[PDB]
């Protein structure tokens, strides 16, 4: 319901670090001028940061009611298709863009300039989207619904597209009820939903970055990221 909202909230909160579990031991407030542009260590870091979210997102998804009742092929295709978008959406919400501070799902905290060489300019686009999301003051329950809506969505190749749309609709209406219960019986809802296409567009820049890095080939992508990259190219 109801129970659906609670389940979604609980899945969200169990998929990320507690405040008390944040790790600042690598964090730098003042980042020294760096002599270089990307090297192998910056590329490896970028791929390690993406990889650190694969298992987390998969376990979160399996707690969404109904997700495990989709065909196994539909589940995998939804997860592959949404992976960058989910990695970015959850990062944007967890991070503190007013301090240039990125907070990863392990609890690792890095300043912008500490991972900018790996991410490239995409990191600035990500912090701009994070500042925009933060201004909206999205509460945890609405966020927990939106995340699920990022994943459970139409994609090309689904075996049971209507069943994906039915589940999406359940989640969308759970969100809409919640937003009325906090604002009762337009603007706010359409503003939450409007972040989803923005997110997808932002993630085109992630695919661009991975293409560039594979072209440069200092460090190849790990196999699961590479598969997600190749499977989500529509050509």
Q: What is the resolution of this structure in A?
A: 2.1
Domain boundaries, the chain: 1-235
CA torsion, points 15, 51, 70, 61, in degrees to nearest 10? 10
DSSP count for the chain of H helices, then E strands: 11, 2
Strands 109-111, 101-103: pairing is antiparallel
Spatial distance between the Cα atoms of 217 and 114, rounded to a whole number of angstroms: 21
Spatial distance between the Cα atoms of 139 and 182, rounded to a whole number of angstroms: 10
Per the rule left: phi > 0, alpha: psi between -120 and 50, beta: everything else, 44 is alpha
196: Cβ contacts below 8 Å, ≥ 6 apart: 146, 149, 150
| Cβ atoms of 88 and 206 closer than 8 Å | yes
Structure tokens at 58: 């998969």
Structure tokens at 114: 């500490």
Q: Is 1.10.565.10 the CATH classification of the domain at 1-235?
A: yes
């Amino acid at each position: 319901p109801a129970n659906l909202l609670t389940s979604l909230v609980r899945a969200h909160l169990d998929s990320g670090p507690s405040t008390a579990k944040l790790d600042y031991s690598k964090f730098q407030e003042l980042v020294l001028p760096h002599f270089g542009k990307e090297d192998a260590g910056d590329v490896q870091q970028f791929y390690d940061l993406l990889s650190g979210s694969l298992e987390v997102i998969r376990k979160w998804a399996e707690k969404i009611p109904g997700f495990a009742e989709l065909s196994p092929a539909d589940q995998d295709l939804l997860l592959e298709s949404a992976f960058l978008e989910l990695f970015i959406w959850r990062l944007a919400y967890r991070s503190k863009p007013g301090e240039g501070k990125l907070i990863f799902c392990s609890g690792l905290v890095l300043h912008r300039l500490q991972c900018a060489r790996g991410f490239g300019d995409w990191i600035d686009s990500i912090l701009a989207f994070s500042r925009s999301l933060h201004s909206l003051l999205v509460d945890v329950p609405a966020f927990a619904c939106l995340s699920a809506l990022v994943l459970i969505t139409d994609r090309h190749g689904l075996q049971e597209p209507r069943r994906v749309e039915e589940l999406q609709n359940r989640i969308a209406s759970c969100l809409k009820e919640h937003v009325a219960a906090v604002a009762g019986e337009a603007s706010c809802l359409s503003r939450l939903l409007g972040k989803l296409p923005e997110l997808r567009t932002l993630c085109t820049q992630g695919l661009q970055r991975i293409f560039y890095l594979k072209l440069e080939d200092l460090v190849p992508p790990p196999p699961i990221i590479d598969k997600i990259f190749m499977d989500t190219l529509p050509f």
